[model samples]
Target: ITGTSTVGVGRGVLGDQKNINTTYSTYYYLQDNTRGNGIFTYDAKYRTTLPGSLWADADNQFFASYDAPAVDAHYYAGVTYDYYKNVHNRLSYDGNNAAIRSSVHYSQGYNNAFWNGSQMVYGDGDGQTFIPLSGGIDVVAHELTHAVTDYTAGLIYQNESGAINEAISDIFGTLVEFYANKNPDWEIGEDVYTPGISGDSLRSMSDPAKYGDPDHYSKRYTGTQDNGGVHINSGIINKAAYLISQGGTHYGVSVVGIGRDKLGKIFYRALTQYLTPTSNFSQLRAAAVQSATDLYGSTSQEVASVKQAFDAVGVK
Candidate 1:
């Protein structure tokens, strides 16, 4: 929908006040024109349908409790867009300024969010388990990062490739959180998960085993569930990535940190330049090694750290 670009004040599900870019027609719609083609958000209205209705507000002041999810979804999409564009020199998920879209309030008692190959969908979790997921910037970025991987590596969503896909999303999602400087941590879905629990999160990159995910390849799940343990096995790759960025000793193997920016550069380069649809864990190791070599010479500490990170995770 075309309309004059506008700004609206709203409080997110976490009660953080922020200004969102909106479109003003008869009613204020959650269409941001400031970035790329546009960033559009929709109200799913507790149904199964997609992109249900472009969210509309009469006064352009999104203060209602129902408006919280939509506000965060709309706002965070722009932030993710900024992350890709400003950090990686990529326009949008497609590197062509594609319009970003999201829908919130997907179903009653729903407890997750996802990128459905085209647009993002957020669930309003059952009150005890989670709040609206978009309230977590990492959750929003993680879902949108799936879109990035779809357009880049095009990794198949099963087994090793799928775990790589999941880890890439987690890596960039955490990077975007740190980039935003919003109480950043290595945990995924911490902000909106388990509203009643104080310190628990859905997953932890620093210590994936804390949630029963394997931090090393030898312990990877080979189960048939979760698309061949895509989520479960991602811990191996996630830990490697965390080590590459932050440095840690895992299983007596130590990795020297090369910092987050270099980690992003190496991984982004690998995803766009070296990875294939059928690439597995070993192949990912090769790609990251090559990527680091390309960015910072074959003999550089960056390359050494990349090798050590993967080796520590037993990916080689």
Candidate 2:
């Protein structure tokens, strides 16, 4: 519904107070008009239905326990939008000002969040493994990056292509986390994962092997589960991306650090320009090399680091 744009105060799942963009029409709704077409967040009511009802608050203050997830989901959506717009010069996920939408509190005890080909959906964890996934900025950005991939590379969500897709999400997710500067690290979903387990995350970019994920091509998983090990094999690319951003040696192979900005630029260029629906691991290596060459010249350290990063991960 159309209404006067407003800002509302809220305490997120982590009990952090923040202001969220809302719309006031009889009630305050989580409808931010400040970015792109808009960023809309909804309440899933512990059900499977999509894009549930538009979250409404009577006093424009979201402090209730149930409002926590919606607040973060709404707030982080805007942050992710800012990350793309300010950092990469992309308008929105679609690069055309497409509206961003999210629904939180999806299904009881559900511990995962996903991009359902259209909008974002977050599950309120069972209070053990996770609290509310939207509380993690990286998680929100990771899921939304899937939308970006859907619009740009359209990488198929299976086999090597799927692994690339997952890695791309993780890459941008970590970049966005750093862009926000909130406890920035190369770990994914650390903020909202395993509340009882500190120093643990769903995945790690800097050292994927810490979580039993492959950090080299020779260790890649080839199996029938996880859509041909999309999640498992993504560690290889994730490790490569980490090596590209921060210099490291793996299996006697070393890479020169080129920093995060250049890594993001090169990868964004590759994702938007050279990658395709069926591009495999080898093709992704080529895409990253070409993208780096296009942005920093073939002889630039950026391009060399890209080569070394892939080589360090055994992605020849």
Candidate 3:
């Protein structure tokens, strides 16, 4: 959309109404030109197709009940993009001004969202398990961070490296949620996960064991399921990150809270500069320590807390 930018109003998945960035040419399209290169969102319209159609409306008002997914998908992409660029000083997912793309309402009764190696793909989710997943800013940011990981560290998607990859997404996702200040908490997908069930989330950073996710190294899954428990073991690293940001004791070890901004800074620096494809939890500890040293100092509490957090989680 090369025409003039416009603002459209719509009700989102949670039935909250908000304004959306659109571009007007012939019809109003889901394009926001204010961001880098641009952010484009599409409607999959409940099919297995790719990217489907450029979501367009005649009046620039998305009021349909089913239009909620597209609304949040478009809005959340911009939020995630702004998070990386504004907070981290990274241009985009690739650290370049690359265009961000997203697809919403993909497949019927679908229950997950993923990076899919290029663009972001979101499912409406079976109502029993989730609402429109884009309603969760953390879910949106979490998937986008995978692209950042792919472009920078290129962490392998299995074993310890994969767990680190998942944890990185969870960490940034939570940070972005806090940055937005919308009912902020350390739980992932709480807003969209199991609307029927109260006080549950897909994963928990504050207490991974809350959802049966391991918070210590000894409980890490070694079996070959879930890509060597990439999602399962991520709880260990997630707990470490949570402790670094909000300082908590686990397994009788303690970490001094360094606040969330400093936590994000250290991890972002480590991800872009030190992490490798096969880096494990111990290596992540070293990278985090070094990143903190680069930002703070070798003797700084940021570095020390990183150490204690990982040590508390038994990373080393």
Error of model 1, residue 46, in angstroms:
0.4
Give the TM-score (vs. native) of candidate 2: 0.99
lDDT measured at residue 301 in model 3 versus the true structure, 0 to 100: 89
Candidate 3 lDDT score relative to the true structure:
0.92
Can you give the TM-score per candidate against the true fold? Answer: 0.99, 0.99, 0.98
Candidate 1 vs 3: which has more TM-score: 1
Residue pairs with colliding backbones in model 2 are none
Name the candidate, 2 or 3, with the larger TM-score value.
2
What is the lDDT of every predicted structure here? 0.95, 0.94, 0.92
TM-score of 1: 0.99
Candidate 3 per-residue lDDT, tens place, 160-216, comes to 999999999999999999988989999999999999999999999989998899999
Lowest-scoring 10 consecutive residues by lDDT in candidate 1?
A: 144-153
> Taking the tens digit of each residue's C-alpha lDDT, what string does model 2 give over 158-196?
989999999999999999999999899999999999999
**Residue 153, candidate 3: alpha-carbon lDDT:** 98
